[PDB]
Amino acid sequence: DKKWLGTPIEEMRRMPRCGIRLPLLRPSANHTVTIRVDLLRAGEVPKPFPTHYKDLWDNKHVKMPCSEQNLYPVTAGSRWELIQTALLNKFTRPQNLKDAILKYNVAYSKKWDFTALIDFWDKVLEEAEAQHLYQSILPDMVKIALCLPNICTQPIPLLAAAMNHSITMSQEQIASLLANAFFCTFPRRNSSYPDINFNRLFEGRSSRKPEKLKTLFCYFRRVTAAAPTGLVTFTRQSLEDFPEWERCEKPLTRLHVTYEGTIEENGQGMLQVDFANRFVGGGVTSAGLVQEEIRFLINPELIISRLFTEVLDHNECLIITGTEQYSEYTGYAETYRWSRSHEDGSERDDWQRRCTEIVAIDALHFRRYLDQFVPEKMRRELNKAYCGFLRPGVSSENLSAVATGNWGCGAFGGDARLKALIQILAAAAAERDVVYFTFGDSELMRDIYSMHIFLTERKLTVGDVYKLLLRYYNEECRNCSTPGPDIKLYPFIYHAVESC
């Protein structure tokens, strides 16, 4: 019968209800704000700040394709002028769009395959869907792309390694930038940063790329038909000191665990975990299509983080507040399909951001299963998840529950029962409740629940549970002969506590 166990989800904290009163939005040394805060009003398109385009071309800011420093050999010509000339043509067939993109990407004329674009346009879409694409959607995308200098007037700083910095920008500004990434206009981006240009989306056959493309065109059609009015904040968070996990005396927090539901639908207003690549968005602009790539597709404003977000180191995460959901889907990986356009129902905070907070935390990839029980590896995942959950200075009563699942399990070789407990300890140390989604795995739901209430009822601390993890390593893993250990973790823990 039971679809969920633990604390009712109804009892878990959510935004906007749990939220603090925001301070007044203003630019500071650690906060770039690219709109007129004095003019920000609900229901209105934000006005760019500053009024006129200003350009920075250096190793600390995005290199904009409209920069006068973006040049091409003729004698140097203006690549921006070349991009305008190339894109301001009728497209009536997919080859025309390919030829347009390649005019200002000449060096890539042999390297870049457009097969998936061609197949999408010619072999997947109806003839009428194809016509609307080239008569309406693509020309609207070109116009928003070419309005970049009027839209994104303020240089965008890179969120580089070890910076603690925020960028708050308009959904509209993001739309202009993404239209640019679609047409592959970002200069000098074709090694510590993810890909931003969409060229790999067009390559290969995969039955995946048609669905990706339908998802993204769903977005592009909405945002070029009617400008979104809200803001999005991107924050790199990078902590210096981590808890002494063996010494931590904090109690565990509440848990809700269910084998039904999704993070994005059932975890509304909660801190939603992106099971991320250390290059944020993973294979979204290429071949990947699991939890991260899906979220970045149905909430495409996430994709822009790849423009400015350097590869995460072990003490870092990215926190994105305000992204809007534009699509619904079914399936997963090879069965992923675009279903329909989604009308996002989320309330907006006082900064006109959708009350949707997503954190990218990258798990480690375990080639060998037992490697993850090594103390250094356990602490690594604890500290990564902790960094991702901690909101320094915010009271615990204003923290939403963490909405997560089997982080780093699947391709990355993570143990679901270990990672569940790791997230439970991280959350407790950050003083947040946990909402855990097992996606059909009803046994794992019982298991996590039973362990959680076992440790809670015996009032073990974070440190107590971590010491047990070390015991598991020392007795069952460190000198283990085989790929798998003699005794499984949860059974080991039960025996150890019931013995003592």
Ligand SMILES: Cn1c(=O)c2c(ncn2C[C@@H](O)CN2CCOCC2)n(C)c1=O
């Ligand atoms: C993280 N994640 C998933 O893993 C997922 C998902 N929809 C399906 N799956 C995959 C799991 O359902 C696969 N399990 C099935 C039951 O037990 C073994 C694997 N969704 C929507 C999701 O967000």
